[PDB]
Amino acid sequence: VLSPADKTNVKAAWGKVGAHAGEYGAEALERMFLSFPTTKTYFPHFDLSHGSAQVKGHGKKVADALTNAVAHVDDMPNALSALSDLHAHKLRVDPVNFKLLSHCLLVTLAAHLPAEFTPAVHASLDKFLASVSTVLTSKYR
Amino acid sequence: VLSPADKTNVKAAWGKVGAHAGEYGAEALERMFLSFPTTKTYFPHFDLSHGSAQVKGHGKKVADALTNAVAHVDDMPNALSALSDLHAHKLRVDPVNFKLLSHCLLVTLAAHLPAEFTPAVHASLDKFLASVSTVLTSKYR
Amino acid sequence: VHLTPEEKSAVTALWGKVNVDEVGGEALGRLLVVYPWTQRFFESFGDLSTPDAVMGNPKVKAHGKKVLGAFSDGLAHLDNLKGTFATLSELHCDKLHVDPENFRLLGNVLVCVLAHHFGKEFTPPVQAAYQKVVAGVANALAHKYH
Amino acid sequence: VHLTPEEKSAVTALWGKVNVDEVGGEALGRLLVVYPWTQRFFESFGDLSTPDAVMGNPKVKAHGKKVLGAFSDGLAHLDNLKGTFATLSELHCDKLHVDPENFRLLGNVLVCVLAHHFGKEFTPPVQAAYQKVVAGVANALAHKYH
Numbered sequence: 112v113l114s115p116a117d118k119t120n121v122k123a124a125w126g127k128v129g130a131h132a133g134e135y136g137a138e139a140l141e142r143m144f145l146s147f148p149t150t151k152t153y154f155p156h157f158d159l160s161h162g163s164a165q166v167k168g169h170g171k172k173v174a175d176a177l178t179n180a181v182a183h184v185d186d187m188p189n190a191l192s193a194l195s196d197l198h199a200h201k202l203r204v205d206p207v208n209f210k211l212l213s214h215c216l217l218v219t220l221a222a223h224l225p226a227e228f229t230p231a232v233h234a235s236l237d238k239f240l241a242s243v244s245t246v247l248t249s250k251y252r
Numbered sequence: 253v254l255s256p257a258d259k260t261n262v263k264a265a266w267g268k269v270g271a272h273a274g275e276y277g278a279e280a281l282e283r284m285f286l287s288f289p290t291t292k293t294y295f296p297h298f299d300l301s302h303g304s305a306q307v308k309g310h311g312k313k314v315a316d317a318l319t320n321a322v323a324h325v326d327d328m329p330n331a332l333s334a335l336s337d338l339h340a341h342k343l344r345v346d347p348v349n350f351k352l353l354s355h356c357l358l359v360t361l362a363a364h365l366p367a368e369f370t371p372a373v374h375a376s377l378d379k380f381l382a383s384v385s386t387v388l389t390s391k392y393r
Numbered sequence: 394v395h396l397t398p399e400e401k402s403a404v405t406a407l408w409g410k411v412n413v414d415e416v417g418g419e420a421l422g423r424l425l426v427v428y429p430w431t432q433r434f435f436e437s438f439g440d441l442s443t444p445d446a447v448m449g450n451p452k453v454k455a456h457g458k459k460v461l462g463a464f465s466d467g468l469a470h471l472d473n474l475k476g477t478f479a480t481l482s483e484l485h486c487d488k489l490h491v492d493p494e495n496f497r498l499l500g501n502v503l504v505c506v507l508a509h510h511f512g513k514e515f516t517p518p519v520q521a522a523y524q525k526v527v528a529g530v531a532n533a534l535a536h537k538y539h
Numbered sequence: 540v541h542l543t544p545e546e547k548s549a550v551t552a553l554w555g556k557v558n559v560d561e562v563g564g565e566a567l568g569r570l571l572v573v574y575p576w577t578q579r580f581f582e583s584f585g586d587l588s589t590p591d592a593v594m595g596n597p598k599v600k601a602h603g604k605k606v607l608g609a610f611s612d613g614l615a616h617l618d619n620l621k622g623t624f625a626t627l628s629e630l631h632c633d634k635l636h637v638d639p640e641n642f643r644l645l646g647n648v649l650v651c652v653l654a655h656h657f658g659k660e661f662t663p664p665v666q667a668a669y670q671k672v673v674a675g676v677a678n679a680l681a682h683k684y685h
């Protein structure tokens with residue numbers, strides 16, 4: 112259950128990113144890559160090297176899609192349904208792995224958004240991410 | 253998303269237990285106790301000894317409440333709402349810990365219900381348990 | 394792997410009662426049944442849709458024959474488990490690209506089938522000293538990841 | 540704990556830049572904020588309802604002062620971490636009854652606050668060699684559980 116406390120919270124928190132979604136996604140991957148080493152097994156064709164237009168290109172993807180979940184947060188399940196599928200029928204990302212980036216996508220916000228990343232936004236940014244990473248696997252069985 | 257494949261599945265799978273819910277609960281605890289040793293930290297007053305009328309008495313509890321979820325599976329969220337509350341306001345059981353018994357409550361079925369515990373019932377008994385252990389924490393934030 | 398000189402004469406002597414051929418292949422066919430996030434790797438295995446069709450594609454019953462071969466091949470290598478699956482860990486890593494967690498899903502099923510075949514034989518104090526062999530055969534197999 | 544002689548001059552030399560007092564107590568107050576399943580143990584701490592009231596609790600800001608004391612007290616005991624937290628693991632086990640996972644929630648926050656205090660200082664190749672110190676300070680602290 113997400114209160115409008117978190118919904119408007121992140122609307123202002125994540126709102127500060129905007130044009131930063133390209134870097135703040137691109138680099139939120141490389142954190143997941145360098146910390147947890149069971150998340151680059153999914154990117155074999157990619158590059159796990161600094162500034163690889165793969166991840167760096169991919170940063171405009173997992174992030175730019177996160178914009179629309181925040182926007183269409185009022186109805187995420189129908190906000191990006193083609194996305195909640197183009198996993199579990201195309202590429203499945205394994206539930207517990209979503210967490211391994213559901214907690215590194217906090218850091219690019221916890222560092223790149225200090226004054227904004229507050230103790231309540233932490234809980235409002237997590238709750239949003241604790242659902243975006245469950246709305247996709249809504250069709251896993 | 254639970255199909256009626258699993259709903260009627262377990263209605264017949266779990267159905268075979270019935271009067272065994274007292275033992276098949278009682279002993280599904282002691283499996284979680286003896287395997288994972290971070291689940292008896294919740295039972296400090298209890299006994300983690302064989303046949304302790306605590307667990308044994310508790311076996312008619314987590315199991316006898318599971319009867320009604322299977323029954324009121326048509327509407328679990330409203331099937332045992334006082335139960336979904338009683339954790340995260342009274343005693344919280346910690347999400348990941350629910351798993352540590354969401355996978356040992358399969359074994360008392362996987363052993364005590366061979367002919368019944370099939371490769372499809374495994375997936376229909378898990379999915380039911382993969383939700384009963386999420387319906388409770390529906391109010392965790 | 395952390396294991397007692399007591400409960401091993403209980404985690405190893407019941408295994409000789411197992412069938413690495415049908416059981417081993419029963420565990421993995423059951424894997425793609427319940428936890429179907431492991432199917433991305435066995436695409437080229439014909440059809441694994443229906444559960445009667447996964448408990449049987451016949452490549453599925455042949456892969457589970459050798460995947461236990463080693464598991465069986467290291468159930469008496471319990472003090473260097475990390476070393477015996479070694480070569481077998483740096484392969485699931487850049488050839489198949491097998492996520493180390495997958496090795497854990499399958500390790501649980503293998504104890505959920507073992508109880509299946511064994512029934513009451515499977516005592517509480519005995520699943521405990523097996524979980525340790527599986528939640529530990531997984532580590533060894535995930536340890537070679539860079 | 541598995542750690543490089545390279546990235547440690549990067550996991551240990553930024554820490555001296557930390558404040559075990561407010562930061563350490565910032566991490567734990569933030570713990571009961573976001574991940575509130577850890578509040579069962581700090582009942583007798585007055586009121587930890589509101590987030591300004593959890594990050595501003597005196598006993599909460601005083602517990603996070605010493606909980607890092609040891610974390611700080613073992614950031615140079617990186618080759619026997621399991622031994623230095625030892626006595627401290629068989630206590631969270633019988634007295635407080637602190638679930639070993641709780642030690643992991645808090646280990647992540649402490650890296651989500653560290654990036655908070657440090658901003659860009661926190662490079663990608665640097666969170667990586669700290670996660671290892673936290674996802675490993677947790678083990679040591681959960682290792683004494685029977």
Ligand code: HNI
Nearest residue numbers: 150153154172173176177202204205208209210212243244
């Ligand atoms: C580590 C597993 C993993 C997780 C947790 C994850 C979590 C998410 C989340 C969660 C908050 C979102 C919004 C998201 C969005 C996306 N992912 Ni994810 N993805 C993951 C692994 C992938 C992989 C693998 C790809 C394909 C990359 C490629 O180039 O093939 C991918 C591709 C995408 C794409 C690309 C669209 C396309 O190429 O057609 C989007 C958008 N994603 N992923």
Ligand code: HNI
Nearest residue numbers: 291294295313314317318335343345349350351353384385
């Ligand atoms: C190890 C953690 C843990 C888990 C995973 C867990 C999982 C579950 C599941 C999951 C499938 C269900 C249906 C369930 C049901 C219940 N648990 Ni759980 N419980 C757990 C720890 C407890 C504790 C602790 C109590 C209180 C015992 C007591 O006597 O105080 C408890 C009490 C209950 C009660 C008792 C009602 C009352 O006394 O008013 C029910 C019902 N439960 N528990």
Ligand code: HNI
Nearest residue numbers: 431434459460461463464481489491495496499500530531
């Ligand atoms: C979900 C995927 C998955 C899991 C859980 C898994 C779990 C295991 C476990 C369990 C702990 C063991 C002992 C094991 C052993 C093996 N696996 Ni696994 N493997 C898995 C996916 C594979 C894939 C994919 C291959 C390559 C198969 C092929 O034939 O191409 C593989 C190949 C092997 C081989 C073959 C060596 C070779 O080809 O040179 C062995 C041995 N394994 N696998």
Ligand code: HNI
Nearest residue numbers: 577580581606609610627635637641642643645676677680
């Ligand atoms: C979510 C709960 C939780 C977490 C994550 C946690 C994580 C940690 C970590 C992190 C890896 C360390 C090094 C640590 C160290 C300690 N904890 Ni923790 N503790 C936690 C809950 C407690 C509780 C509860 C107590 C008793 C506190 C009190 O003052 O009553 C405690 C007490 C301690 C003590 C005090 C010893 C005594 O009272 O005799 C130390 C030292 N700890 N705790």
